[PDB]
Amino acid sequence: SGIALSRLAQERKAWRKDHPFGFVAVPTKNPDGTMNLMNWECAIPGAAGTPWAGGLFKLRMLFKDDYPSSPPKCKFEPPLFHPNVYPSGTVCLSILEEDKDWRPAITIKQILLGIQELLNEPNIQDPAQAEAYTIYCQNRVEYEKRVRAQAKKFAP
Numbered sequence: 001s002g003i004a005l006s007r008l009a010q011e012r013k014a015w016r017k018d019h020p021f022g023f024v025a026v027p028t029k030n031p032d033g034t035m036n037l038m039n040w041e042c043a044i045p046g047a048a049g050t051p052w053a054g055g056l057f058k059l060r061m062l063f064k065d066d067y068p069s070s071p072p073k074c075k076f077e078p079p080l081f082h083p084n085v086y087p088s089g090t091v092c093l094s095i096l097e098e099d100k101d102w103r104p105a106i107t108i109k110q111i112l113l114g115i116q117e118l119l120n121e122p123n124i125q126d127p128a129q130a131e132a133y134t135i136y137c138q139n140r141v142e143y144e145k146r147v148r149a150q151a152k153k154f155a156p
């Protein structure tokens with residue numbers, strides 16, 4: 001898709017010029033070794049001073065051929081403990097749904113910062129996994145304890 005590919009080239013140029021520190025966002029390759037702008041390997045650092053500090057959380061971003069009409073699918077690999085991350089790893093966030101708050105102008109940087117903000121502030125009206133949601137609701141201290149253990153697990 002020429003429209004998608006031209007936008008994704010724009011996004012990559014902008015990302016490389018200015019991105020938030022500690023974040024990664026890199027296109028993958030096709031079986032012939034050429035660049036695949038439709039599938040990016042990304043990583044989000046935990047925010048300092050939070051329970052997520054020191055973790056680096058790997059995420060795949062998958063673009064459909066009609067991008068930027070549609071948002072990318074954003075999937076933690078491996079899946080994470082968080083109330084708004086499905087067991088598959090897929091992120092549930094309103095800016096990431098075409099029929100909710102996605103707008104074509106939203107950039108990859110905005111998406112990744114939006115997901116980082118989600119990590120430290122769950123949306124309890126919108127749960128995506130039972131376990132993290134239940135613990136978040138029942139015992140915030142235990143929730144934080146689990147988040148810290150996960151961040152350690154995913155430290156570089």
Ligand SMILES: S=c1[nH]c2cc(Cl)ccc2o1
Pocket residue numbers: 040041042043058059060061077
């Ligand atoms: S290494 C390594 N593998 C990987 C996969 C994804 Cl989806 C994102 C970041 C990654 O870093």
